[PDB]
Amino acid sequence: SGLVKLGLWGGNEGTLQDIDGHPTRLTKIVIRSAHAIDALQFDYVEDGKTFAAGQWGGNGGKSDTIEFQPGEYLIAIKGTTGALGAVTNLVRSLTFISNMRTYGPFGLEHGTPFSVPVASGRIVAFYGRFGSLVDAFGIYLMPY
Amino acid sequence: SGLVKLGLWGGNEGTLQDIDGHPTRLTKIVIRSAHAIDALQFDYVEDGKTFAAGQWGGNGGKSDTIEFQPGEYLIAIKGTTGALGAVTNLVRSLTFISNMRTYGPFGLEHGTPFSVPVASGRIVAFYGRFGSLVDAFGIYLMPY
Amino acid sequence: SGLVKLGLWGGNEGTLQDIDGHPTRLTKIVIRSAHAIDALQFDYVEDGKTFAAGQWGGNGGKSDTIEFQPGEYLIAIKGTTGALGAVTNLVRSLTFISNMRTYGPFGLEHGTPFSVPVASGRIVAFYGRFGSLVDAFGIYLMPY
Amino acid sequence: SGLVKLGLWGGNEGTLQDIDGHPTRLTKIVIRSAHAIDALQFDYVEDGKTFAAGQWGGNGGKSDTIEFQPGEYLIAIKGTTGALGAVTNLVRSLTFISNMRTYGPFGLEHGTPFSVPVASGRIVAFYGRFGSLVDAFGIYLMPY
């Protein structure tokens, strides 16, 4: 609502998960990953209060936490999608680039790349499809 | 700008004072008032960092602090513009209404009224024209 | 939507009437008026097609049409609300100000003034409350 | 800007070319292509007036015109970037997908792919870097 919504990158399996709020700021990402992306969880701010979205996806893999500093925000996201074992098409890797540093890559960068550089705007939330892994991924952006 | 900008209410004396960037949350207002509005100062959040705008205007009158709680936000602003002494058109009064309570009125409700009820959106910042008193006033809003 | 929605100015009688489209351009206003505002109708554009909203209100008074030229857009709206005979609070007058000329005032400028100068943004649609007359009025804005 | 601006895909050579203001509707694309993308030109609407952006880029290749019907809009863009001749990273191919049909691919789909599926929003304009070819490419999006 007032946000541009990009997606989906990835396949059709899993179950859709999406936000119900009105995010103004992305404060933290928790990503689980191994040979692909296992799960996503993120916190966002609405009317001065923090909300937790997720966890979406399974408890496999290893956990990594991205917690943005004051004045730090994402300027790009990259990743790859493709098959893993019996799953036809899922999210194999993700990389998050802020104005201060790069986080990742998480997962293995097999399959078809995608990339979202942001020239004017802010990334404030995510959605996707999830089962035991991240089947598909999308992004919410606010104009700057 | 990604923000809708309303204004100006008032005259054309004084310094045009404005913010840069794209505030996403208004946290605090400090207002000085007596027979008119003397000064405005407000804190806002951008990219997780708090900034202080102002003080804009002089040190006349009496000071009042409005501090918004998490989950509290403005739903309307009212005011009046008119003459005071030798200044033909400045800001005589302001009232701030949140979802929780009403703050004010501040100043004296003499002159021409104005009113900005918000049915969908968030007030995140202000601008105006300022000398010894508040000569003109405006509002920044983002979609909700 | 990604629109800021301002309102309501006026009273609580009549029926709320609104849009749910995705307007990107206000093309035309048809207004009926006499001692107050009798009715409102407007057209907007979405994906290069024109859509008619309204008519909201009664068939009294006389009709005027405001059709904007290419390159012409509203920079302000003014009006007044107040009693008309036995009605406590309805829309008594409206004035539409574009970057090229002023349309109105329509009705009689009795009652409490309101005014919406737009410093950055575009007015793309309206809503309100309506019976035989225009009981209340509001405005949709997109950022510029 | 009230528009989300994505980019740049491609390299750092050539000269930046961009629009001003806030387009609200994309009406036409003319693209020149052969081994890569040679040039881009597009028509857009702002405040009810149609403007021409470009042509940006060179005179080589062959020309194709995409004329959007009323009710037709882009739902996705895909492309590829990579080296060619004296240029280390430029735009090798572009594909434009509307709600009615697919236009392209133009150029040669050699190099690193990118893809922008729009789940909620409208593509209204483009920008990039240009010399005799299209060195880099970006996209303006409006909330829907």
Residue numbers in the entry:
A (entry chain D), B (entry chain B), C (entry chain A), D (entry chain C): 2 to 145
What do the authors report?
AcmJRL adopt the expected β-prism fold with the three characteristic Greek key four-stranded β-sheets (β1–2 + β11–12, β3–6 and β7–10) and all the connecting loops well defined in the electron density.
The asymmetric unit contains four monomers. One is located in the carbohydrate-binding site 2 of monomer D and the second interacts with the β7β8 and β9β10 loops (Greek key 3) of monomer B. Monomers A and C form a tail-to-tail interaction similar to monomers B and D and the AC and BD dimers are aligned side-by-side with an approximate angle of 45°. The strongest interactions are between monomers A and B, and C and D; they mostly involve strands β1 and β10 with an average buried surface of 826 Å2 and ΔG of −11.5 kcal/mol as calculated by PISA. This tetrameric form of AcmJRL differs from the dimeric form observed experimentally by size exclusion chromatography. The main cause of this discrepancy is likely the high protein concentration used for crystallization (1.1 mM) compared to size exclusion chromatography (0.15 mM) experiments.
